[PDB]
Amino acid sequence: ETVRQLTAHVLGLTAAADVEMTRSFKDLGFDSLMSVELRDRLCAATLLYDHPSPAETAEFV
Amino acid sequence: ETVRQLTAHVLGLTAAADVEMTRSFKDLGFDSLMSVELRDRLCAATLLYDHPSPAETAEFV
Amino acid sequence: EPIAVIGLSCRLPKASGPQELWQLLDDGASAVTRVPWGGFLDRVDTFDAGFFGISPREAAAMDPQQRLVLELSWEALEGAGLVPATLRDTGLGVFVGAARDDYATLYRRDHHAMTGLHRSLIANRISYALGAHGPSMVVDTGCSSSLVAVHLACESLRRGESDIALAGGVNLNIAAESARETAAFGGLSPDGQCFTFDARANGFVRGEGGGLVVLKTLRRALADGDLVHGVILASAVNNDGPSDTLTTPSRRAQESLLTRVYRRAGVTPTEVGYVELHGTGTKVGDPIEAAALGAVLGTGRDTPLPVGSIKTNIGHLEGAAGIAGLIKALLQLRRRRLVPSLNFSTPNPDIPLDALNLRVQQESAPWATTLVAGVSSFGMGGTNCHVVVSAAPLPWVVSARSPQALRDQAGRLAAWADSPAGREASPVDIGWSLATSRTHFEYRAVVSGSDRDELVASLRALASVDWTAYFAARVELPTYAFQRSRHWLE
Amino acid sequence: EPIAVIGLSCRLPKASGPQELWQLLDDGASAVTRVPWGGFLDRVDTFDAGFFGISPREAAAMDPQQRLVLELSWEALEGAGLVPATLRDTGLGVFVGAARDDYATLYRRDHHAMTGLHRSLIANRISYALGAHGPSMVVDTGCSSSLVAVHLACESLRRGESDIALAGGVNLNIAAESARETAAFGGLSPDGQCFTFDARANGFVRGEGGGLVVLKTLRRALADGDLVHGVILASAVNNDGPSDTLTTPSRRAQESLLTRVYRRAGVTPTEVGYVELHGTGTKVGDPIEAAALGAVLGTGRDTPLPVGSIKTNIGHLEGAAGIAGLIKALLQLRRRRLVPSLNFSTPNPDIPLDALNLRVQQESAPWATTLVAGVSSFGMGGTNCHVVVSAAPLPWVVSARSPQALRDQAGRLAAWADSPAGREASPVDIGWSLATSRTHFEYRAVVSGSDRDELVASLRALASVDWTAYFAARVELPTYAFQRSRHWLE
Ligand SMILES: *CC(=O)NCCNC(=O)CCNC(=O)[C@H](O)C(C)(C)COP(*)(=O)O
Ligand SMILES: *CC(=O)NCCNC(=O)CCNC(=O)[C@H](O)C(C)(C)COP(*)(=O)O
Numbered sequence A, B: 001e002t003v004r005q006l007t008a009h010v011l012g013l014t015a016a017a018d019v020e021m022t023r024s025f026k027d028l029g030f031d032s033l034m035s036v037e038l039r040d041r042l043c044a045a046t047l048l049y050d051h052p053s054p055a056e057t058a059e060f061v
Numbered sequence C, D: 001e002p003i004a005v006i007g008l009s010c011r012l013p014k015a016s017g018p019q020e021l022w023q024l025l026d027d028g029a030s031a032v033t034r035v036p037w038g039g040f041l042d043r044v045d046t047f048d049a050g051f052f053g054i055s056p057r058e059a060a061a062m063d064p065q066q067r068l069v070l071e072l073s074w075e076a077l078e079g080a081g082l083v084p085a086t087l088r089d090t091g092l093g094v095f096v097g098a099a100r101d102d103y104a105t106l107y108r109r110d111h112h113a114m115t116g117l118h119r120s121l122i123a124n125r126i127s128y129a130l131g132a133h134g135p136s137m138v139v140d141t142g143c144s145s146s147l148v149a150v151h152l153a154c155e156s157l158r159r160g161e162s163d164i165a166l167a168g169g170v171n172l173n174i175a176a177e178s179a180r181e182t183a184a185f186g187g188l189s190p191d192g193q194c195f196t197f198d199a200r201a202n203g204f205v206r207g208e209g210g211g212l213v214v215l216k217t218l219r220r221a222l223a224d225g226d227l228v229h230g231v232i233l234a235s236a237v238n239n240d241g242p243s244d245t246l247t248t249p250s251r252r253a254q255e256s257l258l259t260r261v262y263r264r265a266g267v268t269p270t271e272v273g274y275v276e277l278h279g280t281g282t283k284v285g286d287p288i289e290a291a292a293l294g295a296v297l298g299t300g301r302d303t304p305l306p307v308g309s310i311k312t313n314i315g316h317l318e319g320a321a322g323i324a325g326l327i328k329a330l331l332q333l334r335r336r337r338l339v340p341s342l343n344f345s346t347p348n349p350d351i352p353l354d355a356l357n358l359r360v361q362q363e364s365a366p367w368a369t370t371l372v373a374g375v376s377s378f379g380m381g382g383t384n385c386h387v388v389v390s391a392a393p394l395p396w397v398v399s400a401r402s403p404q405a406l407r408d409q410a411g412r413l414a415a416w417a418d419s420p421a422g423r424e425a426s427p428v429d430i431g432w433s434l435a436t437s438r439t440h441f442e443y444r445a446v447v448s449g450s451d452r453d454e455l456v457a458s459l460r461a462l463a464s465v466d467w468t469a470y471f472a473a474r475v476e477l478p479t480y481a482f483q484r485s486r487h488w489l490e
Helices: A032-043 A054-058 B032-043 B054-058 C018-026 C056-060 C064-079 C102-107 C112-116 C121-130 C145-159 C176-185 C218-224 C251-265 C285-298 C318-332 C403-418 C427-436 C452-462 D018-026 D056-060 D064-079 D102-107 D112-116 D121-130 D145-159 D176-185 D218-224 D251-265 D285-298 D318-332 D403-418 D427-436 D452-462
Strands: C003-011 C092-097 C136-140 C164-171 C209-217 C230-239 C274-276 C305-308 C358-360 C372-378 C383-390 C396-400 C443-447 D003-011 D092-097 D136-140 D164-171 D209-217 D230-239 D274-276 D305-308 D358-360 D372-378 D383-390 D396-400 D443-447
Touching (some): C003 C145, C003 C218, C064 C121, C092 C121, C092 C145, C092 C318, C102 C176, C112 D176, C136 C145, C145 C164, C145 C209, C145 C372, C145 C383, C164 C318, C209 C218, C209 C318, C251 C372, C274 C318, C285 C372, C318 C383, C396 C427, C403 C443, C443 C452, D003 D018, D003 D064, D003 D145, D003 D218, D003 D318, D018 D318, D056 D112, D064 D209, D092 D121, D092 D145, D102 D176, D121 D136, D145 D164, D145 D230, D145 D383, D164 D318, D209 D218, D209 D318, D230 D251, D251 D285, D251 D372, D274 D318, D285 D372, D318 D383, D396 D403, D403 D452
Parallel strands (some): C092 C164, C274 C372, D092 D164, D274 D305, D274 D372
Antiparallel strands (some): C164 C209, C396 C443, D003 D230, D164 D209, D230 D383, D372 D383, D396 D443
């Protein structure tokens, strides 16, 4: 539940169910600044380049 | 004195002595709208195309 | 060297596609309505951000012109029978003519802000989306920017710099400051109509929209087996030069441009059957254009030359309008028919049509002899362009990125099949085109049947793998169904 | 086909001419000062409206960029030995790359507002001033707009569309909104310095100015007897394509562009003695540029390749900066000397200069073997351009439109004669050039003497007809002395 939430708000979506763990981070509209912001936000609760898929990062938490 | 004055103000110059009766009206930066405005202002006190020089128009008044 | 056109896309008021544009033009209707006087694009604040992999925050501050051009390019690529995924790391050039930044004007009254308000990226983003290695530039020549971009793309193709080119323009009226400036300049028609070559001409009306076309060399198009919409023969760009006024057009410059472009194209008089006028409906430009056309093409003709302008239907689109006119010509080169021109009751006394050997097309009549047409675009600064174009010499699978998108695509396919244009296409050709000329997305839906009725019924019912070996001639198919969501600054 | 350069003009911070620019570069000084951090053009609100026949009211609402480009074009035409009056009704093309509208931004917070706030007219006005019939367009590719315009002018000259071309760019920072947007984007150096290829690189500094050059085919230049400043061999424009980010540049695209441009130019490695870096001083672009240059030109060389950037002296001029760099290269191709590059103390750890076989020029040394140089301009959107240029293979009469202008011209001529460059020119050649290569204005002043001292003394004293049969080789002369008056909106 740490990927559906805490990431849709960063992307600016309204509902957490609008994200799909099938496309790459770049395919979702992620740049260096957004990657840094996502890492900083997830740290409270280059790792994105190592695993460019939300599904892969989901299993880590 | 009707060409040094009543025309420099139309062009936006500060002093009436900055105009020269040697260049054409087009060479002074005159278009159709400014020609119409000049004719209307001079009427109170296509004639410009007939005599495109201020010196020629000076002798008419 | 001739240039072959293999596809086009457009977005115009009351015309979201080439078929809609042809229906509007043939019916003789006008899309100029009241402000929700001018042509409008029925909401421009909607975009499919997920299709192009753009975050909603980025798309919110992005210029809607960029989104419109991206959608137009995708539609043109889909309609040309070329899979975009096969165009990656290729020498594909993009030439878009934009001369308006109303979105930046509204915004100036973030980090993707600067990025979303740059005029160059309007083309560059396409090179980012398609992964093309060809040149990408934005040209600004006024109201003839699109035709200049088309000419530049043709020259680049001739020189071998680019293999496939995308050429066109866009113009969206959003900020009221532009309208205030235009009204202050004194060029808007008081009644909001474009009386092209008419005695009631008192200005022009403003329109918005965009268009794009795909350009490729004729030899490569014939070698690749592509279907040719039209053949551009020659093009030329010049300037008015020593005109009487910076805004006043020059007749001699237009005459020289027409003479040189028709000498380069190799087409003599009595061979061109239609000329697309600039048609601004002004009291000065129209007589000059008519005199130039009569001196160049009007003379030495046994029959009057038909003329017309597309601005009488949708309005003046400024930098984009030019390509729109060319698109109209392309339609007139595909259906072999002419469409009427509105806002014409009596000839202009300043325009001696009898002496100029010209006549305004005001009825729908078949076109008979190959057919050659010319499109002219004149900029207010003084840039003039002319383009001469002649006529060209059972399971069903659908794909989409969303179930709602899949249902919309199925419904659109069923509607197109119900259309007579779809009826003229055999089911085998339709299936082969869907399997080959359409990209395979994530979500897939495959249907089976015996005849058209069964497949159409199944597609409506569900609306609410190497298939090449399984299966012909390539046929046009409806484009992608975009799921647009509101995106605006706040 | 090679292209011959016959003249150039520039306007840069602390450098109002090619001689001033060479003096600034040779002395190793930096023009980046505090805001009255960046380079500034010492008042841009002054214009000579009467010289171009422009009313003060029209010039008040006119973009200062248009005035600057007009003055630059006039100076370039004067310095090329061609009388502007002989260029009327000729096929002369104008290509200016502009990507900024800060004046419109300020004004938007009359009927001239239209013609004064339009980006296209920046070039079109020139076609109105010179009465040229060649194409006139404005290109927008980001920071490489000027190089793209130069390439387009060269292609038009090669295709025969234009006989003489004017190519360059301009960029003026006026509105504070642009500065705020740039600061928000996060690219400004905290200390306001451009550390090109330096370990202290932390961004770039902004500069303003402009430049223009005159382009003609080598065969026509040799036939016309013109003196050649440099010979452009080939040019190429491409796009990054499928980069990691829309902002991140691609190394492979730059390598392919360099390879293709050097293969077209016919110049193999070990023949180019200098390369003009883009030199933005960023932590990402600089290593990529260094790696690409080392992979393309660095390999197969017995000696390290000298590199440098002009942004270390005046700053980043954005869309104009490119042509400025080319101008610098032209200077390095005329004096046969190299100028030092500032803001370089230690090599960047991310840049292996030893492996890349590259070295930064930090001293003034003579250039020895013909000499070949390359100028690169990369657009932030993704457009990249590269240009390869090699080295080229007694009464005095003055004229002006005002007595004060005549006195200023006489004083400038006397000062130029006192300069060593004027001393290297014989009096007969100077008189012949003044009589032939300089246009005759209304007010005229003719002096006579026996030697240089007498003529110079008379010219200073007064500072406060077919002459062809009377008189050689054409030599450069100082340009016109503009009487600038304040013009600003209120
Ligand atoms: C006008 C112009 O072309 N200027 C170029 C000056 N800027 C650069 O070269 C920036 C190159 N890009 C980067 O350094 C990174 O892409 C950014 C801008 C730091 C973004 O990194 P990340 O957030 O994607
Ligand atoms: C965007 C674009 O190119 N639009 C063209 C529409 N406008 C025109 O065609 C204007 C042509 N010029 C004129 O009609 C006259 O030059 C003016 C504008 C009435 C000025 O006349 P005079 O005051 O010089």
